[PDB]
Design a binder for this molecule. Sequence first.
Ligand SMILES: Nc1ncnc2c1ncn2[C@@H]1O[C@H](COP(=O)(O)OP(=O)(O)OP(=O)(O)O)[C@@H](O)[C@H]1O
Ligand SMILES: Nc1ncnc2c1ncn2[C@@H]1O[C@H](COP(=O)(O)OP(=O)(O)OP(=O)(O)O)[C@@H](O)[C@H]1O
Ligand SMILES: CC(C)(O)c1coc(S(=O)(=O)NC(=O)Nc2c3c(cc4c2CCC4)C=CC3)c1
Ligand SMILES: CC(C)(O)c1coc(S(=O)(=O)NC(=O)Nc2c3c(cc4c2CCC4)C=CC3)c1
Lengths: 818, 818
Amino acid sequence: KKDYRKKYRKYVRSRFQCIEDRNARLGESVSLNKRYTRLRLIKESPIKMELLFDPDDEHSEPVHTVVFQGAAGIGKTILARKMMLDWASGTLYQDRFDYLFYIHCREVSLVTQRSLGDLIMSCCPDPNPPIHKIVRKPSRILFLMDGFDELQGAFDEHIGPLCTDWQKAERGDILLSSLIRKKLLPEASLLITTRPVALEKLQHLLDHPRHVEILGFSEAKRKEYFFKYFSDEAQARAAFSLIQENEVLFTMCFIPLVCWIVCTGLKQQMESGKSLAQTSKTTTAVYVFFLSSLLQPLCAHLWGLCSLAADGIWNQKILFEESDLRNHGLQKADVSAFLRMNLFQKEVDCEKFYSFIHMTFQEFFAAMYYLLELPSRDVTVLLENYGKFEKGYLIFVVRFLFGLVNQERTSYLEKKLSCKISQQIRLELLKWIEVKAKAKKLQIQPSQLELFYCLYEMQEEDFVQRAMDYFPKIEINLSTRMDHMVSSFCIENCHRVESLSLGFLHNLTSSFCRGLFSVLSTSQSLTELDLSDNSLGDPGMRVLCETLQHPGCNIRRLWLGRCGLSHECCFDISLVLSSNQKLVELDLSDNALGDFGIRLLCVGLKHLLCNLKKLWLVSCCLTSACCQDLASVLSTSHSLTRLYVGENALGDSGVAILCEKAKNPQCNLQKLGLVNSGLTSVCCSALSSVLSTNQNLTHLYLRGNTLGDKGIKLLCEGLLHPDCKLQVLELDNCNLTSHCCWDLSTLLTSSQSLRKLSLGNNDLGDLGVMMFCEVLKQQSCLLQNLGLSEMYFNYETKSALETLQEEKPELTVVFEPS
Amino acid sequence: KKDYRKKYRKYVRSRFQCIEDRNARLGESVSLNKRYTRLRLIKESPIKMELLFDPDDEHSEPVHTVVFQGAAGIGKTILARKMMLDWASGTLYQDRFDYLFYIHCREVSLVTQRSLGDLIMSCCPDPNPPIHKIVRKPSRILFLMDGFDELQGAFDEHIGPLCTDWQKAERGDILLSSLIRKKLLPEASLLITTRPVALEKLQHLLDHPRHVEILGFSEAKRKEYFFKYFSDEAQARAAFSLIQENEVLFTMCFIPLVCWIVCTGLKQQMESGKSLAQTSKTTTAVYVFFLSSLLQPLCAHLWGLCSLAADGIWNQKILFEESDLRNHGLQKADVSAFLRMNLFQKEVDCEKFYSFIHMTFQEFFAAMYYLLELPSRDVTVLLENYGKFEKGYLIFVVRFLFGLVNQERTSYLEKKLSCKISQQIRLELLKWIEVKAKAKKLQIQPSQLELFYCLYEMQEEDFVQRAMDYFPKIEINLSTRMDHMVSSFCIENCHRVESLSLGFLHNLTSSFCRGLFSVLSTSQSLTELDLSDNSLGDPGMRVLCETLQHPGCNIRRLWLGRCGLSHECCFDISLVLSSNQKLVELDLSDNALGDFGIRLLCVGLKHLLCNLKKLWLVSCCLTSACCQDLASVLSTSHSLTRLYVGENALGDSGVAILCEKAKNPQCNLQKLGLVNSGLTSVCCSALSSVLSTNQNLTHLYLRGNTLGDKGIKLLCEGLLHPDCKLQVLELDNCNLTSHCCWDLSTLLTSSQSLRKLSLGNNDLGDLGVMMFCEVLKQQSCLLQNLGLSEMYFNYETKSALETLQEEKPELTVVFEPS
Ligand SMILES: Nc1ncnc2c1ncn2[C@@H]1O[C@H](COP(=O)(O)OP(=O)(O)OP(=O)(O)O)[C@@H](O)[C@H]1O
Ligand SMILES: Nc1ncnc2c1ncn2[C@@H]1O[C@H](COP(=O)(O)OP(=O)(O)OP(=O)(O)O)[C@@H](O)[C@H]1O
Ligand SMILES: CC(C)(O)c1coc(S(=O)(=O)NC(=O)Nc2c3c(cc4c2CCC4)C=CC3)c1
Ligand SMILES: CC(C)(O)c1coc(S(=O)(=O)NC(=O)Nc2c3c(cc4c2CCC4)C=CC3)c1
């Protein structure tokens, strides 16, 4: 007859019409989900809400879990609400799921015992839905869990009694684990929204999740928001222009919540006949401006509320009863005012409790508590409990505290912050940074990012510059405009930073990094810049190359990784080499800088006053052709001493060119990086001439080649020469056999210059090694690692090797295989 | 980063380079697996090592278990080692298995408790491989179990506590059972090598194995072995030729272990400047020649070693410690000499124990122990424990004892055998043969094969000829040249054998059997030769037919089975019939001897002095056309009395021809085998004429025809004739119905000649039987089986049948259906 499934879709469609889905909607108006602004979704390329659980391009395996992550206040909930509306309307997943259930984490009781009644409680008023029929069929139901990080009370991931069978009642935390792990109602599809910081407590439940990141609004959508928010286009234009002119506030407003806070304040200024001026620069300033603007016209009850918020955070309470309001002196006065204003809501979805409009607001209020004039009111305790899931990580409580603790304060609630208290806290906050800044560890506690966002908020020179003294090495990751804004601010004020590592995330290949590179080049302490494995295309390298020509750079070491740089960029690299007399080490490996790029690079390398000493051209798609220019550089330049060119196609016909010039008596080559070049015995006579002539050559790296016995014999003849000064010889994957052990024995016996000789996976067997063991006792000069890498020997050889280590202590490393 | 799988692949490639994979390699040289000689592999057509675990041509089912069987020293291990090398090199199963684990059974502790650490212990020195990750994934791993029959200690197949879950520890015997049965680490692939004798203790674990037999070297491969073994072509040629001239030693060298022991002894004769002469004829001769040659130059410690070997076999010990050597007086003298020579090895694969170079050698030493001058030194005990898995079956200990117990002994250790002891044993060995020879049973104890191999080794006329007196019937299976050599020798010396059955295995259709057939035809006791179901094509039949013409044959009965003989061979069969006046019974059924072949066969059958009495032409693709020649044979020959021609197409139009001549009053036909000929009622008037005319006809077999009531009625008219002498009438599948019961009742009532009348699956029902029950009481002459085959009746009929049996005792078999 009447199919509940249809009744449920009607319920969902009609229910989720409001954006907030809570009261105090500026006179209880309808905000309309029709105003939904599209979010930028990136998968780990863009992703849509459609096809989230579908198989991808290979193996054709299904997806059971998709997790949405991002910053707070970015519409994770709103995206879920749009999804529910589109599903109910029959436009989204209309051919995939029979039922869609939404479970908010805020309302979940973690410590109480219940059966899986979530499918009843989250749906229609009808107390008897067909749970035992179609609604229990696996794979036909889609669930969404909103706010994993908002789960209150104790929580654990490693629970024996997981609880399967939806019919049985168990603790709420346990029940959630079983559903997330797909042990309860298996094959069900589940969407989870969470802050990245809480992923560490979720990853154990997910096993193999699909990862989707939610990004903020683009400039195009920022304008759209104002025009949809303000019904009068003239107001939308004024509101948009005002904020657009404020680069910092505009950027922060990329976060939908910040945009909302700002738009609401401007609307109120309009209604009140005010100038609509707004000078906020920090996240704190946005929250302080909004709160004081709304209460100023109330303010008398700020204490009772801040105490409530602090008690709420400490005791893991988000949803409050009338008793909790009364216990803080909040009754029949400010509560009503708070509900009239966009500050608090009374939760009108057929329930009986009160709540803050946002968790960032509750944390903001708690932050204010610690500065006014009641769980503790001790910032030491606040900071110590930062690294905890149960307390909600307290990211904003502390970050707002940083911004709030200042001297440059005015009226509008900012005068209610006690001076002595703020001063005592300021000192504690700086010490906190020192302790965490020195902790180079990966965890939920600050990852050397949050410390900088906190310092950005506390935009004061004395405090900020002192904090920077605890960051001699900075390792950070930038994904948006606000991150670069914070990074540039913080690094600009660093006078004691020696090295910086910058990770770049989908924002790349553009001028977006100019605002940071421009700053780095003016640093008087930065020596090493690490840009490894960042997709910065030629345009990114060009911006860097422009900044690397600044006379005040002081940068001595520049490292690149799998950036995909093209041969074209060698034009700009050469321009840097020709004028930057400070650069010593330049690693251009793992790029597409083919023979042409090298031809151009060599222009800078041969340039007068070019002081580059170490050059890595490893894995640069090079052939033997480039050896003509590289050989010219080594001969021409007095500064090049280290050259690595392996993982290319510089075979015997190529190295012969390098050798012709490398052998020059005036050659300054110290390390010859002929690793994976595919060399054989043919060029070994050329190497012999180099080793016996160039007395500055101390290290050979010949791993990856196929020299054979003939090749090593020819090299030995060179190494046996009186004028050979080679100290380190690496012979691992050189395809040598036991037949050459006689030449290696001769080398060990007669060589005087070698200090390290490492033999790797060669077919020397027991004969070669046993022979060496005896030879090495005959007044040998070899004191370093013998090699023996990836080898298996018999008992007697193993005994001889261990014996050698004990009988001749001057040999530091025999390196037995095990 | 670094994948263990790759590190392991490297380990396996570097490890398995030697053939022996043990020391004492003639100066510790490298034998090189590169010298591997291809083995002949036959599946139960040739098979390759590739695709062993793949599905075949139907059902597309996977193979989890593959079992390799063959002679001791046939290269089961070396094949396994080559497999590992080819896999590690990425040429064999490179796209099927990620890991390959080799577990030797010799090193397995059956009685101790352990987890499945075999995946750690069998690999590289690294103590912490990723067992809990990729290495525990089912179906991605191939295991090889080498030497099931070498498992020491107690063992059982029917164990409740099989032990699943690789993480849990249990007894080694139990652990192996679970892995073999695929209960532990299920869906894994396992290759098992074992001696055929031990299959009986493995079959319970395998359930549904793929069977591959390993055969020895061909003549061409033997040449290659010598030319690869001896680096000097001149020496390889002289060495090969020496052996080629020795037919018996040459034949034995089909086993890699035999060609090895022969080549090794010769190499030493070469180095020592000797004549290189070798006169060995038996396996024992080769083993003692080798051992004595090596020790003669030592011999003083033969006692202590033989005692050790005997103690080892008795107490199930293969791997010995220094304590076991010392306890037998073996210390700092001969042990070193034994390790220098190819006799003993000290197991140098990072271990601490000693072992015999070959298991057949350890058993050889034990065999000598019993003859010298300490577990027992009682041959009675040795022989009694032959039929035991735990003791290793003791096949060679006893077989070598047979060869060693002789009078024709010389120096070179053969003089260390005590005369009195050998004489006492010789008597016990002969009695042992008597006891086992009379035991016509299938088991691990001698299957009437090993007894003959033992007698071959003991090549002495008195002992051997006496042994033959216990084999009046010989049933043997020959698969190789050495089997024919032994069979020929043994049967040649049989003076009291009445019948011989020969199974021929892939060796067929060739002259390979000539060496045996030539001997059988000279036997003065052999009467019956059974060659059933052997693929001996016309060439095989021709060789037989040549030997069947020998005047001393004395063969009276020759039986053929599904041999696939062609009509062409009837020419040679006829040649035998025309001159062999002794042959009485010739069964040519289940062949392709169609009408043409019969036309030719009939030439011999009609030949003067052809005494063949019983001829079977059943299932010979015959039609009614052949009846013209068969009828001529029956009329022409005075000797043919029994003719079976069913399972052909000799329908009514055919039998009418046979009847025209069979009815002749001078006809000597006694049994008319017209079974499955497709006859009906039409020819029954012709059969009637035969019955009433030929008084020598006593048996009719009409099963398979479709006569109906009319057909049997017509036969009854013949049977009711005063001159009909038929005694036995078989009427089973004749398609008769209840309507004929009155003619059968008339037949029973009036027939005087019948003694047996068997009615089978005819629709006679309860009425027919009830009628017969009463008729049979009226002074009936029917005393034999009434039939009632595949019939079902009601209560009253059953009662009448049982009553009949009791009331009229002269009726031997009522044959109630149940
Ligand atoms: N795509 C969007 N279109 C319009 N408004 C949006 C959008 N995304 C976010 N917002 C704004 O976000 C505010 C609601 O904040 P919200 O409840 O989503 O914070 P939240 O982080 O999702 O809560 P939670 O942590 O439980 O998921 C509303 O003012 C709404 O207008
Ligand atoms: N295909 C082959 N090519 C070369 N030599 C072979 C080959 N097969 C066997 N051999 C010889 O086998 C000898 C080693 O004896 P082996 O260990 O194989 O006896 P085994 O019966 O396999 O031991 P196990 O009973 O444990 O399997 C070596 O001398 C080797 O030359
Ligand atoms: C990208 C990164 C640094 O790695 C990260 C991952 O997760 C986090 S977060 O949990 O601390 N979220 C936030 O800070 N949001 C947030 C921010 C600002 C202002 C507001 C909010 C919330 C509404 C007001 C200013 C930029 C960050 C940060
Ligand atoms: C196939 C059959 C006949 O059914 C069978 C009966 O017994 C067995 S066996 O498993 O015990 N193997 C052996 O005897 N090998 C073996 C043989 C010879 C010489 C030697 C060996 C071992 C090295 C020296 C001569 C032929 C058999 C198999």
